[PDB]
Every structure is written in structure tokens, then in C-alpha cells.
From a paper:
In this study, we focused on KKT2 and KKT3, which are homologous to each other and have three domains conserved among kinetoplastids: A protein kinase domain classified as unique among known eukaryotic kinase subfamilies, a central domain of unknown function, and divergent polo boxes. Together with the fact that KKT2 and KKT3 have DNA-binding motifs, these results support the hypothesis that KKT2 and KKT3 locate at the base of kinetoplastid kinetochores and play crucial roles in recruiting other kinetochore proteins.
Our analysis revealed the presence of two distinct zinc-binding domains: The N-terminal one (referred to as the CL domain for its key role in centromere localization; see below) consists of two β-sheets (where β-strands 1, 4, and 5 comprise the first β-sheet, and β-strands 2 and 3 comprise the second β-sheet) and one α-helix, while the C-terminal one consists of one β-sheet (comprising β-strands 6 and 7) and one α-helix. The closest structural homologue of the BsKKT2 CL domain was the atypical C1 domain of the Vav1 protein (root mean square deviation [RMSD]: 2.7 Å across 52 Cα). Coordination of one zinc ion in the BsKKT2 CL domain occurs via the N-terminal residues Cys580 and His584, while that in the Vav1 C1 domain occurs via the N-terminal His516 and C-terminal Cys564. More importantly, the CL domain does not have the HX12CX2CXnCX2CX4HX2CX7C motif that is present in all C1 domains. The C-terminal zinc-binding domain of BsKKT2 consists of one C2H2 domain (−1: Ser653; 2: Thr655; 3: Lys656; 6: Tyr659). Our analysis revealed a highly conserved acidic patch centered around residue BsKKT2 D626.
Author numbering: 570 to 668
Amino acid sequence: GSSAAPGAIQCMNRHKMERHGKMPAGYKGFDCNVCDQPMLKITEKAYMYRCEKCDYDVCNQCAESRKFKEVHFLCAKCGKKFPSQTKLQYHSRGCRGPS
Ligand SMILES: [Cl-]
Ligand SMILES: [Zn+2]
Ligand SMILES: [Zn+2]
Ligand SMILES: [Zn+2]
């Protein structure tokens, strides 16, 4: 249950994103889903925002400047948007329609 206001820090499917300013153990990091910058360690200079339900990870620079991916991949069965074909493919394997 989350619908961001236009221009708020949101994921591609308009949910509010959680800021992660600390690192858990076993943290593998990610490549920013918007700019592709590697984010291997969370610090005060380089931190992340995440939407858990979308598996959407963005660096603080892209999130706060409202940068968006210029290519969107959509699931035909539920309409959900993804930043890559690989993430759409992982979703699609287990999707037969809206949850
Ligand atoms: Cl839209
Ligand atoms: Zn980024
Ligand atoms: Zn989301
Ligand atoms: Zn789907």
C-alpha cells in the first residue's frame, strides 16, 4: 500500500522507497538500477534507496535528483515495470497475474 506523490522519492511502480544508510552483514551490493554505478559499500557519501516489493535499488545521487531509467520493461501479466530485461525475466517466471 504505497503511492508516491508526483516527484517524490519513488520506484518505477510509484511506491515510496526506503533509505538504507547502514550495511547488513553478507551485503553483496548492487549496480544502481538507473546509472549502473557499482555500490559495494554503504557510506555517508554513497548510500542507497530500495523498493523491496519491486527489487529496485538506486544510488543516493539518482534517487535525490529524481533520475529515471530511459528504458522500461513491463510484465504483460500484471503491468509491473522493471529497469532491465533480466529483472523482468526473473519476475515473469513466477508471475501468472496480479497478486
Ligand atoms: Cl505511469
Ligand atoms: Zn545511480
Ligand atoms: Zn516499488
Ligand atoms: Zn507480472
